[PDB]
Design an enzyme around this catalytic site. Sequence first.
Site, PDB file in Angstrom:
ATOM      1  N   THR B 105     -22.065  35.938   1.477  1.00 53.14           N
ATOM      2  CA  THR B 105     -21.737  34.433   1.062  1.00 53.14           C
ATOM      3  C   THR B 105     -20.234  34.242   1.084  1.00 53.14           C
ATOM      4  OG1 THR B 105     -21.770  35.334  -1.172  1.00 53.14           O
ATOM      5  CG2 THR B 105     -23.734  34.183  -0.589  1.00 53.14           C
ATOM      6  N   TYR B 106     -19.706  33.153   0.967  1.00 57.09           N
ATOM      7  CA  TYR B 106     -18.235  32.854   1.137  1.00 57.09           C
ATOM      8  C   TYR B 106     -17.525  33.956   0.288  1.00 57.09           C
ATOM      9  CZ  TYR B 106     -13.995  29.975   1.760  1.00 57.09           C
ATOM     10  OH  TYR B 106     -12.647  29.725   2.065  1.00 57.09           O
ATOM     11  N   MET B 107     -16.359  34.469   0.910  1.00 60.78           N
ATOM     12  CA  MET B 107     -15.554  35.761   0.259  1.00 60.78           C
ATOM     13  C   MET B 107     -14.270  35.141  -0.316  1.00 60.78           C
ATOM     14  SD  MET B 107     -14.804  34.976   3.670  1.00 60.78           S
ATOM     15  CE  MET B 107     -13.559  33.418   3.767  1.00 60.78           C
TER      16      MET B 107
END
Lengths: 250, 251
Positions: B105-107
């Site tokens: 998922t978005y970091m």
Amino acid sequence: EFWEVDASTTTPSGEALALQVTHQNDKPFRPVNKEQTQAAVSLLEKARYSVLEREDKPTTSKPGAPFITSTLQQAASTRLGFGVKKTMMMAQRLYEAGYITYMRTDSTNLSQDAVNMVRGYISDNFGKKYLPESPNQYASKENSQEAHEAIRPSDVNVMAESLKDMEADAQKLYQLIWRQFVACQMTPAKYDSTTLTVGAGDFRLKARGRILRFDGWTKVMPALDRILPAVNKGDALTLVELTPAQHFTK
Amino acid sequence: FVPEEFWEVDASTTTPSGEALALQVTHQNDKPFRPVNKEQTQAAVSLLEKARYSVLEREDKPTTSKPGAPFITSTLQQAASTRLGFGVKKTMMMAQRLYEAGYITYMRTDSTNLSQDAVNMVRGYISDNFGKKYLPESPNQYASEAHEAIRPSDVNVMAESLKDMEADAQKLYQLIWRQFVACQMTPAKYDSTTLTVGAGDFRLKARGRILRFDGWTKVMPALDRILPAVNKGDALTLVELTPAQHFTKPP
Ligand SMILES: [Zn+2]
């Protein structure tokens, strides 16, 4: 006086590995003052750590026999902190509620129905590598009705958690008895008795203990040298902490 | 590296049964022992070397070690530093790589939230690959822009079977994967023992703990030994006092 330096590192897979600095410039590491030790630390801080060698000696660890009065008292003291009085009292309550076999016994004997019952349980809840070909025997002489029996669960399908009616300590003592019993009929744990040599700049560090290859009985009864994470020659380690300490000859 | 602000002094002792017992000085004159330099450490040692050691108290109690929350940006950077030795830029770069490839998922997040699907997904994995004792009765929620923690898009995808992802990105993925799975597993349980010892104007303690259930530590290794039997009032044989200081990798 002299100093020692211990190092905490992380293996490639992120596991903890404690090492002792043993050599510097291929000779024994033993700085004599804070000055020399702190300088060694600075160097250690900046070095790249890698495993130079891993020496293995295969070993196996057999489960212990099911409990008898003496061994239950020793294990309850060690694992639970229970004195002899509390141990016999809780064992008494468990025996009277019908949860375990008689608590006064010096025989590790297991009845046939008990062996079949636990092997069935092991066969149902663990892979086949966890079940020995034949039952594990402890003490010479087989069972025959009125013979003595080790202290064990009356029914292995009954876990400590289900004893909602017994007090906390009785449940904990039951779990201990239950685990020793189930584990005594499981296969040995297999290890690699090892010595790991690590290189970091001009230093050499080491760790000695054992790497787990197969947990076997330890899967149900955690084993009390130390267990080292598995690492291979050539692996890189990440230094996380250095601990210098001062010792005195006298 | 960062030196701790206070040195410490350990004592190597023996019990009435001849068993080794390791202690740490915790108090001097009833106040917390906090020597700031090697010098005040030598002083404490001189007083302790001539004192009598006696057990003041022994305590045995069950303790638990709960899993940590799924990663967010800051905690991922820290864990990557400690467990992999990755600098922040290297971590973020590998993260960006794993993201654009659709693996995680978005970091860049400050949220420890996990979607219902994510939770059900990982609990399903836990149920299939581990005993029943490893799956909490109810999910684990953590206290806390993005809106979700950094975690793998698919729990079934292992780092080893990634693809055109380089070595470090594969390792960074395993770390993220393990933290994610462990955060939904049960707590590790232990039986702890605390010993308090009295010596002259000082007080020392020994802490030990026996592992009873590994729980989450089965997939994510935590980052201690068995204390010998002794009772209140027991005298201890002093073997050696050892001043020491810790140097830890900076954040
Ligand atoms: Zn007899």
